[PDB]
Amino acid sequence: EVQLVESGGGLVQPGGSLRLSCAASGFNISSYSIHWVRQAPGKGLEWVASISSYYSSTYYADSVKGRFTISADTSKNTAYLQMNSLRAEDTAVYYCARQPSYHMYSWWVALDYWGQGTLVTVSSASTKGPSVFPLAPSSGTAALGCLVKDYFPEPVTVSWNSGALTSGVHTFPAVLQSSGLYSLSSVVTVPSSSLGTQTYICNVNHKPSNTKVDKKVEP
Amino acid sequence: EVQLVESGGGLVQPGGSLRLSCAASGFNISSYSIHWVRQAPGKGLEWVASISSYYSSTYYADSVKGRFTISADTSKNTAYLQMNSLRAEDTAVYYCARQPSYHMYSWWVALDYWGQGTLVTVSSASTKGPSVFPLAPSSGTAALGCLVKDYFPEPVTVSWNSGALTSGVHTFPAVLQSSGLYSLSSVVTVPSSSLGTQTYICNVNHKPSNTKVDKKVEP
Amino acid sequence: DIQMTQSPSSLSASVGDRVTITCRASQSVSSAVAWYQQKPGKAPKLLIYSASFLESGVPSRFSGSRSGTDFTLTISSLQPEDFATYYCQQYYSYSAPVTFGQGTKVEIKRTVAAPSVFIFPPSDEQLKSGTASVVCLLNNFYPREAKVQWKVDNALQSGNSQESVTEQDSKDSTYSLSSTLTLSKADYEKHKVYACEVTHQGLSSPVTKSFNRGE
Amino acid sequence: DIQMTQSPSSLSASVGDRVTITCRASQSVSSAVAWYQQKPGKAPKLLIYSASFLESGVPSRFSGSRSGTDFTLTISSLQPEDFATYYCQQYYSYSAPVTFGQGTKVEIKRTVAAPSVFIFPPSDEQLKSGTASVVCLLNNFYPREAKVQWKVDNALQSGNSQESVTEQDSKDSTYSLSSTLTLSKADYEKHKVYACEVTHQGLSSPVTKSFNRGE
Amino acid sequence: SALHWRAAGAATVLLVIVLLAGSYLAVLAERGAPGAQLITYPRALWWSVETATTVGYGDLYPVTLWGRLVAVVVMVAGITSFGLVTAALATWFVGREQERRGHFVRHSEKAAEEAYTRTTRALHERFDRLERMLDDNRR
Amino acid sequence: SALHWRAAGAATVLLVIVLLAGSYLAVLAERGAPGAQLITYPRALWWSVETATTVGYGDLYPVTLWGRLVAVVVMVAGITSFGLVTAALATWFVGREQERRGHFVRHSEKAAEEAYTRTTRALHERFDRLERMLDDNRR
Amino acid sequence: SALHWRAAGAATVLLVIVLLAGSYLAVLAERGAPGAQLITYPRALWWSVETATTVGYGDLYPVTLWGRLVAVVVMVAGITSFGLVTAALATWFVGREQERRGHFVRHSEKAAEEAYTRTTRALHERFDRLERMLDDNRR
Amino acid sequence: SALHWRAAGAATVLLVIVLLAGSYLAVLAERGAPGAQLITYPRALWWSVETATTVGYGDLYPVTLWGRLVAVVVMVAGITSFGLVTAALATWFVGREQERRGHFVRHSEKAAEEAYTRTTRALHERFDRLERMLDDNRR
């Protein structure tokens, strides 16, 4: 069953260098071409490297030249994109799709099977868990929440009452503060009459920080 | 003014070898390609070789291969055919002609400028002179002529009065005699009223043996 | 290299509607285009691969017609789940094909809506840190087009507020904002009237939630 | 390699007529054929190249049409002089590339004519050499079809006569045969009645000429 | 193959033989000659050595006509035995040049092969892709 | 490093040792022998020299059976020590030509690299054309 | 007939001549000289031998001024005659490697010729194809 | 003058100098020494010769400590003066291998260049042709 596994993504101090891998499974890279396509955080789609390990060949976008180096090892089954001299603007999700080489019709399909891409955050920011502050609700329609604030690097999950509350919830897209740390708020609307009865608690979990937390929202 | 000048033709002992030259005149052979098209004695048309001196390439028909060796020299401006190991059947009228190289719409007009051909005549049979006997006329319409008979090899030219009598003149195609030599009469019709006034002479010239003749024609 | 200009930036429309997105190439591409559909969170899904034919397993309402240099993907009768960002790709160049377009994002149109406003004064514990921060909230509204100003003691606050809207909702089909102040404790205490201003294409009078510090 | 088959082997027709010759390429020849006209004596003349267009400066009555693999040269309203030997050429292969077709000879046909028969007495000198020779002549006649019998004293002769027809003229469009006898001197004085016998498809009664030896 | 010891030991064996021959011939040939002390084999054993290595200490040597022909043959035999061993040592010296010559041609032939081949490939890819702009587009 | 002084100095060290051995063995072995003056080491020191360089002046030398075995060994040791050094001068002169001949590979190879890689730049240029030839003439 | 025996036999002939000259000059030149026994040719014959092979037994030699000039010329002539036969042993052993290395050129050369000419066979092939793809797909 | 005579004549001049020096030093250094007859320069002149060419006739030679240090220096000088002239003759022998090895890289490089080049050409022709099969047919 043909699929693709990008791996290696991570954090890197602007300047430093990374190496992503695109484990291919289901098809022999030998006779295929791997594509590395990244997607800026919250922007559009941009292609980066490329490589037909058949016709011994590589290709690069302009947005990168002296930096990235694409290559593949047909012994194993993978194409490795080698980031280098990473710039703060290289931060994003790097996918690694495929396409048929230059043979029969096959080649007329665009990017056949895409992968799920990784995340490379180029930034001098240092990893830190968030701080969670309650969003004291006030006045059957009330609003309350948490404020996952000051953490790095992306991304974090916020769940309510370990699952209880899941209707009428808004865990917002984190916006990056000028300090170098992301920060988000997750509000949710509840019935007034449940502010003294029902309990409300957000579950904040930061994987890269290896830290998870829960906080109760009490008025 | 573009033209070609085939040269070198002649008589060769079956087996012997020759070398034909096709001096170009209006175009630069360099950026062109020369063709060596021959024609059996009285038969049809056959091509023998070709040589695009531009793309340093040569070509040969199958009827010849381990024998002929087309080759050109662009220092001068001529294409040569090195016919080796000549075979009895190789006798004919070797013409040479043009055709543009593989370049801008020109390669489409076939052999746009043929030459005039020479006549390689292989044979173990050797050269000999003819004889010029008159054909005394008799009786505004009378026929007279000469009889270039017993010669070899072809060809022989015959004109009347150096060019005076040219109208109403029939110089017949030599027919090979059972001796091994050719022969043919060159007749002409003239007004009887001028058999005692105007003078009639056939000019004979069998170059192959340096035999010039001028025979007057009186009843 | 071949660039890709893809109109329209973004397009709103109801279901059943007939949507058509164009995409003109910067030069001969030779009917070697492709079309991609991307739903927030998943890697692009291919739809049309030649500008003509469509990848085995695609909804019949998807078509591509090449106008020489101009391309246009068209959804027959927009269904309910065909909302995503559509990317236009060219694969002709000999600088490894791939040159996507800015992409168009098709979203669901729906009756107007006002935004439920809310404001949360800086968390106690926060101040112990050293930087307090206010935070408005326009809840479930429509259209995204909106703007919230701020005001500490009726004096407009500039450049110190970060917004963020949620990706259009599954059923309500409404947008939810979320602005926020930030001021060194010292400063948060230098005043006493943190108000959140709100204007909207669906409000007679601009809703203005706010509060006084300490109460 | 590509070969060529050309029909008709030999074509006959008069002026005004419309002539059409065909040539079929033993293989695919992307409109890479040319049309040649060779008047006995000179070398070929390019008429049609590409199989379509015609060499600058060629009669309008000339043209060709491509039938995939079959090529045909057509002469609209055949003129008088357009008589010659026509050659079909393919120039595609990369067996560089010229291969001519066996050819088709179009001889201008007309009405019969008066085969002005004659006969020449063996030259003086000839005898002194030791071999005299008589020679008949069927000046300007039509059609080539003809024969001549020799009679040394009204006794038919066989196996010592040699004919040779001129090729068809450019105007008169008539042929001219040429016969000759050969006998050692001693055998020329062994008789006294040398008469040339003539037959023709254009004569009511076979014309017969001769001459008195030494009279 | 221990041919280098079979061609080296041979000249070594042929050497000894003549170093045992002159000490076998220049001995019995030195009996009854003026100033002929070299009447012993063991003493002539050293004689053929000084003769081969051309040292000629000058204490043991012939004075006869036949005892001298055997001496000069031992003189030349020595020069030959060491003139060859010397040129045989050059086979192991200029022979390492063969291994340096046959190895420099490695890096130089490598740099090329790539270039060339990497071009042949640059064609295939190029061909196919063209080939694709074809048939596939019109069909 | 270059082990040319280790293999050269070795034959030089092995030389001295035998040039110190013969003058160490042919001395104590020349005591009580007829005409044995070579009982001194300093005099036998020069003795092993004329033996090595095969000069054999003929004023100082052995006469014993064991004093001659040590002497013949000094004779051969000399030839071996100089037959190797002379062959070291050749490898050094013929090996230096491999350096000036190895530089000839520079002009011969790097000239073929840039060339076979300029034709590649072309090869495409060509195809590219054709591609344009259709895609520009057809669709 | 040959050119390696005429150049080798020449130095061989020139060798004998001088080996016959010194024994012809240093003889009559050694008559009436202090310690001049070398007055005989046959004895001087062996003299020029120990002189060439530089053995110098020291029983037969000149003492004159002209008889010594001829002697030194025979000394050098010997070194020259064997120094050439030695350098000729090297060129013969190093030249034989050029034959086996020249054969190494056969395996490295003719292999590249047949290959670069097997690709040419291909180059056309693919071209031929494309030609067809057009002429067979369009007209 | 011609350099090959300046580097050859040099070792020849340096040779004479030492063949005149040892006969200049080993003379005055042999006065008052046990068995020192070599007290004349002209007699030592021949002495340094038999020392250099390592002949050691054994009639004229030193016996002193300082007169022997100058002798051994004349022994080595000889070997040096002739070991260099012999390896120089090899330059003209193995140097004809260079011309045999260099006259080889030509024919082998020539056979290649044609093959290759005649291929680049094989492409152009092949290229235009195809190219001619296009645009022209269509337009």
Side-chain angles (χ1 to χ4, degrees), chain A, chain B, chain C, chain D, chain E residues 1-100 102-137, chain F residues 1-100 102-137, chain G residues 1-100 102-137, chain H residues 1-100 102-137:
Chain A
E1 179 179 296
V2 168
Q3 67 151 178
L4 283 131
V5 183
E6 296 94 2
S7 45
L11 197 178
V12 258
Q13 59 294 70
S17 295
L18 279 195
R19 179 199 208 61
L20 310 190
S21 307
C22 183
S25 51
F27 60 80
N28 276 60
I29 283 163
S30 165
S31 44
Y32 256 124
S33 62
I34 297 290
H35 275 303
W36 278 100
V37 160
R38 72 180 182 190
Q39 180 148 51
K43 268 188 173 298
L45 252 181
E46 171 181 49
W47 162 89
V48 174
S50 167
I51 179 181
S52 290
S53 35
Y54 182 157
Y55 307 151
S56 262
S57 72
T58 98
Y59 302 71
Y60 300 96
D62 276 334
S63 51
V64 39
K65 184 136 295 188
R67 299 187 303 160
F68 296 176
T69 316
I70 187 158
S71 67
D73 172 319
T74 50
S75 83
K76 322 203 182 317
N77 192 79
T78 327
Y80 312 31
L81 186 164
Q82 157 87 200
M83 319 258 249
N84 264 319
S85 306
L86 289 168
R87 196 168 305 178
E89 294 79 0
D90 280 321
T91 288
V93 205
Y94 286 69
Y95 298 105
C96 76
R98 111 172 193 298
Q99 172 186 42
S101 75
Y102 278 151
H103 270 269
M104 263 302 306
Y105 254 112
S106 308
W107 176 76
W108 287 98
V109 181
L111 287 291
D112 229 33
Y113 285 26
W114 287 56
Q116 294 304 55
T118 326
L119 192 149
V120 214
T121 37
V122 181
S123 184
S124 59
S126 192
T127 325
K128 310 165 193 174
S131 302
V132 209
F133 307 127
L135 275 195
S138 61
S139 60
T141 49
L144 72 179
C146 276
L147 180 72
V148 197
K149 193 172 181 305
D150 291 290
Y151 71 88
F152 178 80
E154 267 292 61
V156 308
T157 65
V158 171
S159 59
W160 290 93
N161 301 304
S162 297
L165 211 181
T166 116
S167 185
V169 212
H170 291 317
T171 302
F172 292 120
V175 58
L176 174 161
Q177 310 179 182
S178 51
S179 71
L181 285 48
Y182 303 111
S183 163
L184 71 165
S185 74
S186 197
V187 304
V188 65
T189 37
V190 305
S192 322
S193 45
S194 67
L195 291 173
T197 313
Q198 297 298 61
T199 202
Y200 293 127
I201 305 166
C202 76
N203 310 181
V204 185
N205 191 180
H206 190 306
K207 3 290 184 64
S209 74
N210 168 58
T211 334
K212 179 282 189 63
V213 78
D214 305 306
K215 172 61 75 70
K216 185 156 66 180
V217 186
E218 286 287 300
Chain B
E1 181 180 299
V2 179
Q3 65 155 177
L4 308 180
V5 188
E6 303 84 348
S7 34
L11 198 177
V12 217
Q13 59 284 60
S17 304
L18 284 194
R19 185 195 204 72
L20 312 181
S21 304
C22 174
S25 66
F27 52 96
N28 269 70
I29 272 174
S30 168
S31 47
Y32 262 97
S33 56
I34 303 296
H35 275 294
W36 268 128
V37 148
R38 78 179 167 181
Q39 173 161 39
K43 272 183 167 293
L45 261 183
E46 170 182 47
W47 162 95
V48 173
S50 179
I51 179 175
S52 292
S53 50
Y54 182 165
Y55 313 149
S56 190
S57 66
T58 109
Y59 303 87
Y60 299 143
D62 283 326
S63 47
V64 42
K65 182 145 292 187
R67 304 189 299 130
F68 289 19
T69 324
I70 209 176
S71 62
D73 193 325
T74 177
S75 305
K76 303 87 183 76
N77 197 68
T78 323
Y80 317 35
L81 207 174
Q82 175 55 189
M83 319 186 291
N84 271 324
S85 301
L86 295 149
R87 187 179 301 174
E89 298 73 9
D90 290 302
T91 47
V93 191
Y94 293 71
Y95 307 99
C96 65
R98 279 171 62 196
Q99 171 165 45
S101 306
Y102 285 140
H103 268 285
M104 245 293 83
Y105 242 130
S106 32
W107 172 87
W108 285 119
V109 324
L111 310 249
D112 92 326
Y113 256 48
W114 293 49
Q116 283 299 40
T118 322
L119 185 155
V120 185
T121 149
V122 50
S123 137
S124 55
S126 52
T127 48
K128 281 181 184 176
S131 306
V132 190
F133 314 123
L135 294 189
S138 57
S139 55
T141 49
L144 68 172
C146 285
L147 183 94
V148 204
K149 177 177 180 302
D150 297 296
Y151 70 65
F152 174 77
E154 269 298 58
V156 314
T157 61
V158 181
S159 57
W160 294 81
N161 295 306
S162 307
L165 202 184
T166 86
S167 190
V169 203
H170 301 305
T171 305
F172 296 95
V175 54
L176 186 149
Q177 296 184 179
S178 55
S179 58
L181 297 53
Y182 301 128
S183 174
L184 72 173
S185 64
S186 182
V187 309
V188 53
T189 54
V190 303
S192 307
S193 49
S194 60
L195 279 176
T197 310
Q198 295 293 56
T199 187
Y200 291 129
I201 312 170
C202 75
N203 301 180
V204 184
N205 211 171
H206 179 289
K207 37 287 172 69
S209 82
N210 171 56
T211 298
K212 231 289 180 52
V213 170
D214 272 303
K215 186 51 62 65
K216 188 175 66 177
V217 198
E218 283 292 287
Chain C
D1 165 276
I2 307 172
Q3 285 300 167
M4 296 307 236
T5 338
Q6 179 179 315
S7 158
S9 316
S10 55
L11 119 177
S12 178
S14 296
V15 34
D17 309 50
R18 191 188 195 63
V19 183
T20 71
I21 303 165
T22 55
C23 173
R24 208 180 328 176
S26 65
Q27 87 191 66
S28 65
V29 129
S30 296
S31 65
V33 179
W35 284 102
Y36 292 68
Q37 173 171 72
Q38 170 178 281
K39 291 180 179 176
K42 305 301 182 62
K45 178 188 170 189
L46 159 54
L47 298 180
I48 319 215
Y49 78 140
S50 189
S52 182
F53 294 61
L54 68 72
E55 170 83 350
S56 186
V58 163
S60 319
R61 47 185 174 306
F62 291 126
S63 61
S65 66
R66 179 191 187 195
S67 180
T69 302
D70 295 284
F71 297 79
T72 293
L73 162 75
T74 280
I75 305 183
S76 310
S77 179
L78 187 53
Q79 263 301 69
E81 77 306 63
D82 286 326
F83 291 123
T85 326
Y86 287 70
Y87 293 114
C88 175
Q89 164 189 54
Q90 78 88 320
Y91 51 66
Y92 184 46
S93 86
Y94 186 24
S95 83
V98 215
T99 318
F100 298 115
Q102 301 185 300
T104 298
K105 184 160 69 176
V106 188
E107 76 87 2
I108 158 186
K109 185 194 302 178
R110 62 132 289 185
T111 64
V112 195
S116 304
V117 176
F118 290 95
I119 168 171
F120 301 66
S123 59
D124 27 281
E125 179 185 355
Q126 237 225 308
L127 287 76
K128 284 196 173 184
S129 79
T131 303
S133 48
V134 191
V135 23
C136 206
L137 192 186
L138 280 43
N139 207 63
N140 295 68
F141 65 78
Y142 188 112
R144 193 190 308 97
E145 291 55 52
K147 285 185 178 181
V148 321
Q149 299 195 302
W150 278 86
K151 301 176 183 177
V152 292
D153 285 55
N154 300 179
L156 208 298
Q157 276 310 313
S158 198
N160 71 306
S161 63
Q162 297 181 54
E163 276 179 45
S164 181
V165 304
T166 178
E167 189 92 57
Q168 186 172 49
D169 178 87
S170 177
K171 305 189 176 180
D172 322 354
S173 295
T174 64
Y175 297 95
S176 308
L177 227 319
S178 173
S179 212
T180 339
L181 266 243
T182 27
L183 312 63
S184 62
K185 176 185 179 182
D187 272 69
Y188 176 65
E189 315 199 313
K190 205 176 302 303
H191 297 283
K192 190 184 287 65
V193 183
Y194 297 75
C196 164
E197 175 91 62
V198 178
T199 270
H200 185 64
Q201 182 60 298
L203 291 190
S204 57
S205 181
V207 178
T208 305
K209 268 49 189 63
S210 51
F211 72 86
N212 299 207
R213 58 181 299 276
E215 265 157 301
Chain D
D1 172 295
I2 280 188
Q3 269 297 173
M4 297 299 254
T5 334
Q6 187 182 311
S7 186
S9 305
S10 49
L11 160 164
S12 176
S14 304
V15 50
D17 306 49
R18 202 187 186 68
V19 173
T20 70
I21 308 174
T22 71
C23 195
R24 185 168 35 174
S26 64
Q27 194 176 306
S28 65
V29 173
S30 65
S31 65
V33 176
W35 286 113
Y36 292 127
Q37 172 178 63
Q38 162 175 279
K39 297 177 181 175
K42 310 303 181 63
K45 178 185 174 184
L46 179 50
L47 298 175
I48 309 301
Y49 64 45
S50 185
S52 181
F53 296 58
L54 56 70
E55 168 77 347
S56 182
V58 166
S60 307
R61 46 190 169 294
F62 287 126
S63 64
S65 58
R66 189 190 186 190
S67 179
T69 295
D70 288 293
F71 295 82
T72 281
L73 168 53
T74 288
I75 311 185
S76 1
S77 182
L78 163 47
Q79 265 303 74
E81 75 291 62
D82 298 330
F83 148 63
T85 310
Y86 286 60
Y87 289 115
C88 165
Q89 171 196 57
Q90 78 89 316
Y91 62 47
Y92 180 63
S93 67
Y94 188 38
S95 180
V98 278
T99 313
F100 294 109
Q102 293 181 296
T104 294
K105 191 148 64 177
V106 173
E107 71 97 357
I108 292 298
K109 161 173 291 184
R110 69 163 289 78
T111 68
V112 185
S116 310
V117 175
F118 290 83
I119 185 169
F120 291 103
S123 58
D124 355 290
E125 297 182 65
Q126 248 207 296
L127 289 70
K128 284 195 175 185
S129 75
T131 296
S133 308
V134 197
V135 49
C136 204
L137 172 166
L138 293 55
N139 196 61
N140 303 57
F141 82 75
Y142 189 125
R144 189 193 302 88
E145 287 57 54
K147 291 184 177 182
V148 304
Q149 299 194 308
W150 278 81
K151 299 180 181 178
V152 289
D153 292 46
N154 290 182
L156 210 298
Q157 282 302 306
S158 289
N160 73 305
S161 51
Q162 287 178 46
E163 282 184 47
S164 183
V165 310
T166 171
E167 201 140 326
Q168 199 190 317
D169 193 10
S170 64
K171 304 290 182 65
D172 307 358
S173 314
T174 55
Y175 301 54
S176 303
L177 212 320
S178 184
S179 189
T180 307
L181 255 253
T182 43
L183 320 70
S184 64
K185 177 185 178 181
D187 274 68
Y188 174 69
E189 309 183 307
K190 195 177 308 307
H191 297 291
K192 187 180 288 66
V193 185
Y194 291 87
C196 168
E197 180 71 62
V198 184
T199 292
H200 195 59
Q201 173 63 298
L203 296 177
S204 59
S205 174
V207 183
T208 300
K209 259 62 170 56
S210 60
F211 75 119
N212 292 300
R213 45 167 306 184
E215 193 178 306
Chain E
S1 57
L3 189 58
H4 53 183
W5 284 170
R6 295 169 56 182
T12 299
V13 175
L14 184 61
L15 176 65
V16 182
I17 297 179
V18 185
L19 292 179
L20 300 177
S23 312
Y24 179 72
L25 306 178
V27 178
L28 180 59
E30 282 299 297
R31 299 183 179 181
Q37 304 181 302
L38 198 62
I39 60 178
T40 313
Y41 291 66
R43 72 172 62 192
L45 190 63
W46 159 284
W47 162 85
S48 60
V49 177
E50 62 184 300
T51 300
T53 61
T54 61
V55 181
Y57 261 163
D59 53 302
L60 296 170
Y61 49 69
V63 298
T64 52
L65 180 59
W66 292 167
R68 283 183 172 182
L69 295 175
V70 171
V72 182
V73 174
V74 177
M75 307 167 100
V76 184
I79 306 176
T80 300
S81 298
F82 299 72
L84 178 162
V85 175
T86 301
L89 297 178
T91 293
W92 248 82
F93 302 168
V94 182
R96 221 183 186 70
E97 136 183 349
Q98 293 274 359
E99 308 302 356
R100 114 148 291 281
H103 203 188
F104 202 131
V105 300
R106 186 64 288 204
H107 176 66
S108 69
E109 182 183 63
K110 286 181 179 179
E113 290 197 60
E114 280 199 301
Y116 163 72
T117 193
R118 288 302 159 67
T119 245
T120 81
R121 286 170 179 171
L123 261 86
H124 268 56
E125 171 168 62
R126 232 62 185 59
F127 266 116
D128 300 325
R129 181 228 219 290
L130 189 177
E131 184 156 343
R132 187 72 342 74
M133 289 324 96
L134 254 66
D135 279 55
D136 323 50
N137 187 59
Chain F
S1 65
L3 300 68
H4 52 184
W5 287 165
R6 296 169 54 180
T12 298
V13 173
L14 185 63
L15 171 61
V16 183
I17 299 177
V18 181
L19 295 180
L20 298 177
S23 304
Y24 180 67
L25 306 178
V27 179
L28 178 58
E30 282 298 299
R31 299 184 176 183
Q37 303 181 300
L38 201 62
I39 60 179
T40 314
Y41 294 66
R43 72 172 62 189
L45 193 62
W46 157 286
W47 162 83
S48 58
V49 178
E50 62 185 302
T51 302
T53 59
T54 65
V55 180
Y57 262 161
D59 54 302
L60 298 173
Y61 46 68
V63 297
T64 56
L65 178 58
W66 292 166
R68 286 182 171 181
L69 295 175
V70 179
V72 179
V73 175
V74 178
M75 306 174 98
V76 184
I79 305 177
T80 300
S81 297
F82 296 71
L84 178 165
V85 175
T86 296
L89 295 177
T91 180
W92 266 57
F93 272 56
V94 181
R96 208 277 211 58
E97 296 182 300
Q98 71 202 359
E99 171 63 59
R100 254 50 278 285
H103 186 306
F104 188 106
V105 182
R106 241 49 208 175
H107 202 303
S108 175
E109 198 238 43
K110 295 181 179 181
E113 179 61 57
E114 306 171 59
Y116 293 41
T117 208
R118 281 177 182 180
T119 165
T120 180
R121 312 170 188 295
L123 173 271
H124 278 60
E125 217 314 65
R126 218 79 231 318
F127 276 97
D128 259 303
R129 148 171 273 172
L130 272 173
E131 260 168 52
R132 300 173 184 175
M133 290 253 100
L134 305 98
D135 308 292
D136 191 67
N137 186 61
Chain G
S1 38
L3 186 51
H4 48 184
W5 288 164
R6 291 168 55 186
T12 298
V13 174
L14 184 61
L15 174 61
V16 184
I17 299 177
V18 182
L19 293 180
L20 299 176
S23 305
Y24 179 70
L25 305 177
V27 177
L28 180 58
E30 283 297 301
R31 297 185 178 183
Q37 300 181 301
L38 203 61
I39 60 178
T40 311
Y41 293 65
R43 70 172 60 191
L45 192 63
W46 158 281
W47 163 79
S48 57
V49 176
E50 61 186 303
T51 300
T53 60
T54 61
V55 177
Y57 265 159
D59 57 302
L60 298 172
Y61 46 69
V63 293
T64 55
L65 179 56
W66 293 165
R68 285 182 172 182
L69 295 175
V70 180
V72 183
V73 175
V74 179
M75 307 172 97
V76 184
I79 304 176
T80 298
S81 298
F82 297 72
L84 180 164
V85 177
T86 300
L89 292 177
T91 181
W92 265 57
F93 271 57
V94 181
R96 167 84 153 305
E97 294 182 296
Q98 293 278 305
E99 172 62 57
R100 296 287 60 187
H103 185 301
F104 190 105
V105 180
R106 314 312 290 185
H107 205 302
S108 168
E109 229 265 332
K110 299 179 179 181
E113 179 60 60
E114 303 174 63
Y116 292 45
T117 199
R118 278 179 184 182
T119 161
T120 180
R121 307 176 192 296
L123 174 274
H124 282 70
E125 226 307 66
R126 307 218 78 273
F127 260 103
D128 259 301
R129 146 172 285 172
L130 251 167
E131 243 160 57
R132 302 172 189 176
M133 307 207 94
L134 290 129
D135 314 291
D136 190 66
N137 184 58
Chain H
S1 60
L3 189 53
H4 54 182
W5 287 163
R6 295 169 54 183
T12 298
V13 174
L14 182 62
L15 175 63
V16 182
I17 300 176
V18 183
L19 294 179
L20 299 176
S23 309
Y24 179 68
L25 309 176
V27 178
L28 184 56
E30 281 298 301
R31 299 183 179 183
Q37 305 185 298
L38 197 63
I39 57 178
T40 311
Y41 293 67
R43 73 171 58 190
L45 193 61
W46 160 284
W47 164 83
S48 59
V49 177
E50 62 184 301
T51 300
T53 62
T54 59
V55 180
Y57 262 158
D59 56 301
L60 298 169
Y61 48 70
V63 296
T64 54
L65 180 59
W66 294 166
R68 284 182 173 182
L69 295 175
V70 177
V72 186
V73 173
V74 177
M75 309 171 103
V76 184
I79 304 176
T80 303
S81 296
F82 298 70
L84 178 162
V85 178
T86 300
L89 298 177
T91 291
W92 248 80
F93 302 168
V94 181
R96 218 184 190 71
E97 135 182 352
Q98 292 297 359
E99 307 299 359
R100 146 146 191 65
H103 197 184
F104 220 128
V105 300
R106 261 284 60 172
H107 177 65
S108 62
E109 183 185 62
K110 292 181 176 182
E113 291 195 60
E114 282 201 302
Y116 164 78
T117 204
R118 291 302 162 67
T119 248
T120 94
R121 285 174 179 170
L123 258 85
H124 271 56
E125 179 159 48
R126 230 66 185 60
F127 264 112
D128 303 311
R129 195 218 207 291
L130 184 175
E131 173 164 344
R132 182 57 10 60
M133 253 17 70
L134 284 60
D135 270 62
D136 321 299
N137 193 54

